């Protein structure tokens, strides 16, 4: 059973390392998208 | 006579289909009995008793084939048709009910 | 993405059974997903079925009890039902709505697909080739499943159609003369069987390659309609985008058909033949035909729909409309079940139209086609001789007839009878075939060419 | 025999363990984004621009003859400016004269990062145009790209169609 | 030309502000341009039946009205292409998108506008000349086999004002301009014709020329005629491939159209995969069948409107080429699948059902479909002629003949090529039942046969008598074992076997038997029946007393002659010419008659 | 605690009766008790649903029933099972549900029968022909099924170890009898294998003296399972010994037949047919087990002396 927990810990460590590499870049893009509102009138509005 | 005269129903379909399967199984088993008697008869050619047994067996097999099954098949086809006729009259009434509801809805607007 | 704030309405015109009729709704879509919040804080899901001007009509997935026309709010998403798909969802168990029920996280999506999808362009459809062995001799050496066909299992109520379905999930795989997955969807399944499927897949180590959807008998009936669409949407992602072969098993399509009839009634449609919708044909084809091989890709989807025959009548619209648009049938019988034979599959009325392409040199073994045909003839004759024995007796039989009776008894005991935990690969199944065929001297094996006999018959 | 079942349970739970860990990483990132949005709304000119846009988008989605804007009390000065500007822009775009009021009696909870809610005249239709709701909406719809960015692309996925 | 969506109740979309619309017009609903038709109209509102999924359609969406009803686009590029039942090129959709799916709302023009076709004017017309409907004003060179003749659309006429010079033109250019009463019409190479309308002809002629298929059975005993209509059973084990390939490969028709109605995906794949691989010798060169073929593909999960319309799209394409003077042979893979699609639509529209649930008008639709076949005198001054044949198949649930679709079909088609599965299990191909099959064109062809072959007609009559007698004797043989049996009956039984074995049976996987020319079919049958007649006389003229001839004596006496009769099928028309094969058959007859002579 | 509702009560109470019953059932389930809920009729419930569906003028489905009939029955039937209850005590209770579908006929196309069959795990179908012949309890035993076999196999193997294989053989005999009955009705036993004759005769022993019981008698008001297994064990043990004897001595000099067995040990069949009368509770468990053990020893000695 030890090999199963050992592999699990290693996979979690990998994910933690990988997501750190560009964590700030993903957050930066996400903040940009939500901050830019881009208002629009429904495409079927006809007046 | 022409039909077993069982009133059209889904129950009648089940009974007639089981009756047909029984008749067909009996036909095949009696046909094998006849073939076995015919082979033994030809091998012998207690001889006339085989000729009588074959004539009786073949007559019963012929009746199943020419009288009893045709009659079950005519009955089953009759049932199937009449059940679709009952389905149609239900369709008509349900369609008219839906239209009457639509008319009531339009009046309410 | 939309990036458009959602609108939530408290305007309700009325509620009628499973439907909530809304008012003053801005540019509503058909098939739009909305969420309800009830006065007690209870949340429910639903889908818009009719949009007549500003009067949108939404079907609520859960029960409508407790819903008023004054405080209940309806939040619109602005989109339709799109399922998050990924490779990681393989090895997960979901309910009909696509939510996890295995205590794991929500799926972390690689994409979103419309679950209704589109038909596969026939110009790029590739005729099925290799075989996918099931592990069950009765349907590997007699009616094999080609890698791309759609062959249903018809069973009567009470027969072990679910135990066979579970056995296929545990045993099925490629011939292997890592790229095979099974997507399993159970519609209208009761609590006891739902436990059976979930535990049986987990315990035997097969779950790593199974994506399991359970729609329980007491789950929303509309969810039962999307359940097979979610299973097929996943299958299409896994098969065609990730280059692997997916076996899709749709269990209890008869329960699906009943839920479809309920949706038709919700729309106030006039019932068709035997109470079922007039579009049942196209709806079943929409599900079944989303399978097969495609040009330029190495993936494939097969299907094994499993259907309960009402009153054991193959004429009933459910097996009739299915069979009319599928390629052959497995056919589980009752006599074999009452005789305590498992699996109870009757090879005489079964058929696999694609067997000709599934098997043969380069796919299974050279002698596959010849063994199947001879076993079929020997079984049919053995049954015929057994029927004769019942009329003429044992003493009236000749030596050849006795050999056919010996075959009949050993065929059912060795070839058909298997057990739920014995996995017979295609090569062992054929070897068992030969052991039974070597009962007869060579001259009685009329359907096997002499070249095949000289190679395989001895030893 | 029983050892096989034990191994099945260990492998199946191990798979869920790592999947749950990955979902926590996503949750933590989203929580950080929310805290970073809190830092944004603590600004003045940048936040007012967000409100100018958010109010317009609210008005354009609701399209009613009368509208009421509800906001956090401390944000009222900024929303007031956003509404006064949004109105003549709305009228030009839609050619409909809409009376837009601000709710001075009810306010949004002070713990909300920011944004507004828009109600129609009878308070029966509301637009979920708060900042936290917009973030959740976009973060979920964009999640497939977040997955790839953080953890890598699917090596077994060859066709994106 | 736009209206707006008022509401959606499922596959049915209600439009508003759509006053200027006709029933069974076409609309493109929503931003994805979903294809549908207008059925019910009321005021300025219209009820639209949408073929594809309506998920996502919003209230307020645009509806684009298209003036033409359900129509087929006809022009260069039609050949070699595979179409959807509503005329959507599947080979372009799959190649212009790189997808495997048919996009929802896909809008690919039926005929591509990026091909520069080689167009040659008729060189007979001049500016100021009079042209009428059906006239040919130029020919497009598509491939080595079929020239695509460009006709003036029906219901158009006038004085020609512009003729394009010879050159390379695409399907969007203007080739001919004509003026009628001051109204100028600019025509390209493409014409559009409503699919439910029958293309007019000058006159409908009797069908007298045989359809020269390559099979000895389904020709000698059960003739089909160019312009005629037949039915073919469609069961898994019936071996329908043999007719499909034989008819499309070796027929004397010019253009083949294969129409799917709504079959299993894998069955459509087999057809789409097989057809491109078929070839035939033409001018000594081996050419692909797809250069003179067009195919319409519909699987069971295609929109029901397309599955229902497929049968009419196919025949509309057939008539289009019929009007060119070509002989066209169209096969409907399963008219039962079409009827299923028709019942589905009738059900969806909540129409009152009739027999076995089918629409009340099922029979009327089949009758008017098949009536469109036949030999015709074409429109236009060229005084050309052509024909459309239909060999549509039937596959009723259960294989029964009680289904209204098969029963109605059999009462309409004049030839029935009844196939069987038992024959296939016995490896006897083509799998023709014989006792069920019939042809009602035998009288129509009597003039052709008399003019060109003379002895064919009495031979086929005797052949049916011999084959039928073999069946009639079956009960006597079963109960007797050929012991208490006339020697004349033994001749019938054994000769009927010879016919069944070495004539009606044909092995298409052998190079010599790929195609049996008619002169060989009648040659083989003539010698077999001539033997039969001589054998009957040998016994009957000697059966009085003392010294009589029996079948055992004949068979033992001239066993080489009976063998030579069986050997006749091996005379390969590719290497042994007409004169050599006829000469060998003539020598066989002489050797045969002389062998009998020695017995008297 | 029963819930009483007659046919002349309002249709709404006729519908609600089932919901009231199961509500009480779950209530006691949550106490850790094992609750057994018996319905008199679910066809009357379906009838109430049909009546109300009509009155509400909503679109019906087959035979006038609401299209959601299956959903209502599933909702009731799925409210059952062994559970781990909420609450600190960690108690575990159960609800069993016994439905009751009044048969317009033996055709399972009946909307209520069909919807029930798709949900319930055990179906005890009652044959019309057995009822007409006054064979009680009247169970078809060829169209019936129980889907709990594998669940109970652990129990049976733990406590009895003998039942599972006896159950298998008993089912084989009954099905073989039906197939032999079909031909016997046609040819009159003119030609039968010696083994086939035994199957027919043992199957009659089973049908009359094992599967048939008068539930108003002291001896068969309740037959405890240990006794049910005892009875079946002896009858099958007879079968195996009778079948072995004739097949072992077949194609030899001293051929053993059924006629020889019945004449040789006729009292053995009488004793086997008498097992239903041992009368539990009035008589003791220890004696009934000992009495059946004696029958087995006598049969073994009877066949030993025959062979």
PDB file of C-alpha atoms in Angstrom, chain C residues 94-226:
ATOM      1  CA  UNK C  94     -21.823  10.534 -12.160  1.00  0.00           C
ATOM      2  CA  UNK C  95     -25.571  10.869 -11.806  1.00  0.00           C
ATOM      3  CA  UNK C  96     -27.893  11.651 -14.705  1.00  0.00           C
ATOM      4  CA  UNK C  97     -27.296  15.396 -14.473  1.00  0.00           C
ATOM      5  CA  UNK C  98     -23.528  14.985 -14.797  1.00  0.00           C
ATOM      6  CA  UNK C  99     -22.772  15.656 -11.145  1.00  0.00           C
ATOM      7  CA  UNK C 100     -20.281  13.430  -9.286  1.00  0.00           C
ATOM      8  CA  UNK C 101     -21.682  10.946  -6.783  1.00  0.00           C
ATOM      9  CA  UNK C 102     -18.344   9.329  -5.913  1.00  0.00           C
ATOM     10  CA  UNK C 103     -17.268  11.955  -3.349  1.00  0.00           C
ATOM     11  CA  UNK C 104     -14.778  13.338  -5.860  1.00  0.00           C
ATOM     12  CA  UNK C 105     -14.574  16.878  -7.195  1.00  0.00           C
ATOM     13  CA  UNK C 106     -16.588  18.423  -9.986  1.00  0.00           C
ATOM     14  CA  UNK C 107     -15.077  17.664 -13.381  1.00  0.00           C
ATOM     15  CA  UNK C 108     -12.284  20.045 -14.314  1.00  0.00           C
ATOM     16  CA  UNK C 109     -13.274  20.522 -17.928  1.00  0.00           C
ATOM     17  CA  UNK C 110     -11.129  20.350 -21.028  1.00  0.00           C
ATOM     18  CA  UNK C 111     -14.043  21.576 -23.132  1.00  0.00           C
ATOM     19  CA  UNK C 112     -17.808  22.031 -23.237  1.00  0.00           C
ATOM     20  CA  UNK C 113     -19.933  20.147 -25.767  1.00  0.00           C
ATOM     21  CA  UNK C 114     -23.599  20.438 -26.636  1.00  0.00           C
ATOM     22  CA  UNK C 115     -24.992  17.112 -25.502  1.00  0.00           C
ATOM     23  CA  UNK C 116     -27.319  16.914 -28.508  1.00  0.00           C
ATOM     24  CA  UNK C 117     -24.303  17.209 -30.806  1.00  0.00           C
ATOM     25  CA  UNK C 118     -24.504  16.606 -34.536  1.00  0.00           C
ATOM     26  CA  UNK C 119     -24.787  13.562 -36.804  1.00  0.00           C
ATOM     27  CA  UNK C 120     -21.539  12.133 -38.108  1.00  0.00           C
ATOM     28  CA  UNK C 121     -21.013  13.031 -41.761  1.00  0.00           C
ATOM     29  CA  UNK C 122     -21.597   9.748 -43.646  1.00  0.00           C
ATOM     30  CA  UNK C 123     -18.916  10.617 -46.197  1.00  0.00           C
ATOM     31  CA  UNK C 124     -16.267  10.127 -43.511  1.00  0.00           C
ATOM     32  CA  UNK C 125     -17.739   7.043 -41.851  1.00  0.00           C
ATOM     33  CA  UNK C 126     -15.497   3.983 -42.010  1.00  0.00           C
ATOM     34  CA  UNK C 127     -16.971   0.473 -42.231  1.00  0.00           C
ATOM     35  CA  UNK C 128     -16.191  -1.481 -38.896  1.00  0.00           C
ATOM     36  CA  UNK C 129     -13.103  -3.702 -38.960  1.00  0.00           C
ATOM     37  CA  UNK C 130     -11.340  -5.339 -36.019  1.00  0.00           C
ATOM     38  CA  UNK C 131     -13.109  -7.065 -33.103  1.00  0.00           C
ATOM     39  CA  UNK C 132     -13.670  -6.027 -29.491  1.00  0.00           C
ATOM     40  CA  UNK C 133     -13.747  -9.200 -27.423  1.00  0.00           C
ATOM     41  CA  UNK C 134     -16.227  -9.240 -24.558  1.00  0.00           C
ATOM     42  CA  UNK C 135     -14.841 -12.154 -22.558  1.00  0.00           C
ATOM     43  CA  UNK C 136     -18.134 -14.031 -22.858  1.00  0.00           C
ATOM     44  CA  UNK C 137     -17.811 -17.056 -25.132  1.00  0.00           C
ATOM     45  CA  UNK C 138     -21.474 -17.070 -26.154  1.00  0.00           C
ATOM     46  CA  UNK C 139     -20.935 -13.726 -27.912  1.00  0.00           C
ATOM     47  CA  UNK C 140     -17.277 -13.968 -28.958  1.00  0.00           C
ATOM     48  CA  UNK C 141     -17.169 -17.271 -30.837  1.00  0.00           C
ATOM     49  CA  UNK C 142     -20.741 -17.099 -32.131  1.00  0.00           C
ATOM     50  CA  UNK C 143     -21.892 -13.467 -32.547  1.00  0.00           C
ATOM     51  CA  UNK C 144     -18.855 -11.246 -32.152  1.00  0.00           C
ATOM     52  CA  UNK C 145     -19.035  -7.458 -31.889  1.00  0.00           C
ATOM     53  CA  UNK C 146     -17.165  -5.641 -34.636  1.00  0.00           C
ATOM     54  CA  UNK C 147     -15.141  -2.585 -33.717  1.00  0.00           C
ATOM     55  CA  UNK C 148     -17.786  -0.109 -34.771  1.00  0.00           C
ATOM     56  CA  UNK C 149     -21.134  -1.823 -34.837  1.00  0.00           C
ATOM     57  CA  UNK C 150     -24.222  -1.394 -32.666  1.00  0.00           C
ATOM     58  CA  UNK C 151     -25.688  -4.679 -31.455  1.00  0.00           C
ATOM     59  CA  UNK C 152     -28.517  -4.604 -28.709  1.00  0.00           C
ATOM     60  CA  UNK C 153     -29.195  -7.186 -25.968  1.00  0.00           C
ATOM     61  CA  UNK C 154     -32.936  -8.028 -25.862  1.00  0.00           C
ATOM     62  CA  UNK C 155     -34.033  -9.652 -22.568  1.00  0.00           C
ATOM     63  CA  UNK C 156     -37.273 -10.338 -20.766  1.00  0.00           C
ATOM     64  CA  UNK C 157     -37.974  -8.784 -17.384  1.00  0.00           C
ATOM     65  CA  UNK C 158     -36.412 -10.850 -14.589  1.00  0.00           C
ATOM     66  CA  UNK C 159     -33.484 -12.158 -16.627  1.00  0.00           C
ATOM     67  CA  UNK C 160     -29.902 -11.331 -15.563  1.00  0.00           C
ATOM     68  CA  UNK C 161     -29.348  -8.645 -18.237  1.00  0.00           C
ATOM     69  CA  UNK C 162     -27.698  -6.329 -15.660  1.00  0.00           C
ATOM     70  CA  UNK C 163     -25.320  -9.036 -14.418  1.00  0.00           C
ATOM     71  CA  UNK C 164     -24.174  -9.696 -17.984  1.00  0.00           C
ATOM     72  CA  UNK C 165     -23.838  -5.932 -18.546  1.00  0.00           C
ATOM     73  CA  UNK C 166     -21.598  -5.726 -15.464  1.00  0.00           C
ATOM     74  CA  UNK C 167     -19.618  -8.757 -16.621  1.00  0.00           C
ATOM     75  CA  UNK C 168     -18.973  -7.099 -19.983  1.00  0.00           C
ATOM     76  CA  UNK C 169     -17.662  -4.001 -18.217  1.00  0.00           C
ATOM     77  CA  UNK C 170     -15.249  -6.057 -16.116  1.00  0.00           C
ATOM     78  CA  UNK C 171     -14.078  -8.377 -18.895  1.00  0.00           C
ATOM     79  CA  UNK C 172     -14.331  -6.480 -22.188  1.00  0.00           C
ATOM     80  CA  UNK C 173     -11.230  -5.270 -23.967  1.00  0.00           C
ATOM     81  CA  UNK C 174      -9.170  -5.459 -27.109  1.00  0.00           C
ATOM     82  CA  UNK C 175      -7.978  -8.718 -28.629  1.00  0.00           C
ATOM     83  CA  UNK C 176      -4.290  -8.108 -27.778  1.00  0.00           C
ATOM     84  CA  UNK C 177      -3.094 -10.271 -30.650  1.00  0.00           C
ATOM     85  CA  UNK C 178      -4.183   1.110 -22.641  1.00  0.00           C
ATOM     86  CA  UNK C 179      -6.339   2.662 -25.382  1.00  0.00           C
ATOM     87  CA  UNK C 180      -9.733   1.180 -24.484  1.00  0.00           C
ATOM     88  CA  UNK C 181     -12.455   2.713 -22.348  1.00  0.00           C
ATOM     89  CA  UNK C 182     -16.029   1.844 -21.445  1.00  0.00           C
ATOM     90  CA  UNK C 183     -18.792   4.368 -20.834  1.00  0.00           C
ATOM     91  CA  UNK C 184     -21.725   2.810 -18.972  1.00  0.00           C
ATOM     92  CA  UNK C 185     -25.120   4.498 -18.598  1.00  0.00           C
ATOM     93  CA  UNK C 186     -27.962   2.936 -16.575  1.00  0.00           C
ATOM     94  CA  UNK C 187     -31.404   4.550 -17.106  1.00  0.00           C
ATOM     95  CA  UNK C 188     -34.194   4.042 -14.529  1.00  0.00           C
ATOM     96  CA  UNK C 189     -32.076   1.746 -12.382  1.00  0.00           C
ATOM     97  CA  UNK C 190     -33.316   0.864  -8.916  1.00  0.00           C
ATOM     98  CA  UNK C 191     -31.247   1.483  -5.791  1.00  0.00           C
ATOM     99  CA  UNK C 192     -30.196  -2.146  -5.336  1.00  0.00           C
ATOM    100  CA  UNK C 193     -28.880  -2.510  -8.881  1.00  0.00           C
ATOM    101  CA  UNK C 194     -27.230   0.914  -8.790  1.00  0.00           C
ATOM    102  CA  UNK C 195     -25.202  -0.309  -5.824  1.00  0.00           C
ATOM    103  CA  UNK C 196     -24.391  -3.517  -7.695  1.00  0.00           C
ATOM    104  CA  UNK C 197     -22.926  -1.649 -10.703  1.00  0.00           C
ATOM    105  CA  UNK C 198     -20.947   0.872  -8.644  1.00  0.00           C
ATOM    106  CA  UNK C 199     -19.427  -1.643  -6.232  1.00  0.00           C
ATOM    107  CA  UNK C 200     -18.782  -4.383  -8.798  1.00  0.00           C
ATOM    108  CA  UNK C 201     -16.810  -2.025 -11.025  1.00  0.00           C
ATOM    109  CA  UNK C 202     -14.799  -0.548  -8.159  1.00  0.00           C
ATOM    110  CA  UNK C 203     -13.941  -3.805  -6.397  1.00  0.00           C
ATOM    111  CA  UNK C 204     -12.547  -5.621  -9.447  1.00  0.00           C
ATOM    112  CA  UNK C 205     -10.126  -2.887 -10.496  1.00  0.00           C
ATOM    113  CA  UNK C 206     -11.903  -2.121 -13.766  1.00  0.00           C
ATOM    114  CA  UNK C 207     -12.995   1.362 -12.745  1.00  0.00           C
ATOM    115  CA  UNK C 208      -9.830   2.985 -14.129  1.00  0.00           C
ATOM    116  CA  UNK C 209     -11.297   2.500 -17.608  1.00  0.00           C
ATOM    117  CA  UNK C 210     -15.021   3.020 -16.898  1.00  0.00           C
ATOM    118  CA  UNK C 211     -17.040   6.227 -16.913  1.00  0.00           C
ATOM    119  CA  UNK C 212     -20.253   5.359 -15.102  1.00  0.00           C
ATOM    120  CA  UNK C 213     -23.530   7.272 -15.240  1.00  0.00           C
ATOM    121  CA  UNK C 214     -26.331   6.181 -12.915  1.00  0.00           C
ATOM    122  CA  UNK C 215     -29.853   7.508 -13.411  1.00  0.00           C
ATOM    123  CA  UNK C 216     -31.941   5.945 -10.665  1.00  0.00           C
ATOM    124  CA  UNK C 217     -35.606   5.017 -10.905  1.00  0.00           C
ATOM    125  CA  UNK C 218     -36.486   7.761  -8.416  1.00  0.00           C
ATOM    126  CA  UNK C 219     -34.351  10.394 -10.148  1.00  0.00           C
ATOM    127  CA  UNK C 220     -35.889  13.142 -12.303  1.00  0.00           C
ATOM    128  CA  UNK C 221     -37.398  11.622 -15.427  1.00  0.00           C
ATOM    129  CA  UNK C 222     -36.081  14.402 -17.667  1.00  0.00           C
ATOM    130  CA  UNK C 223     -32.570  13.656 -16.416  1.00  0.00           C
ATOM    131  CA  UNK C 224     -33.037  10.168 -17.702  1.00  0.00           C
ATOM    132  CA  UNK C 225     -33.356  11.689 -21.185  1.00  0.00           C
ATOM    133  CA  UNK C 226     -30.023  13.544 -21.091  1.00  0.00           C
TER     134      UNK C 226
END
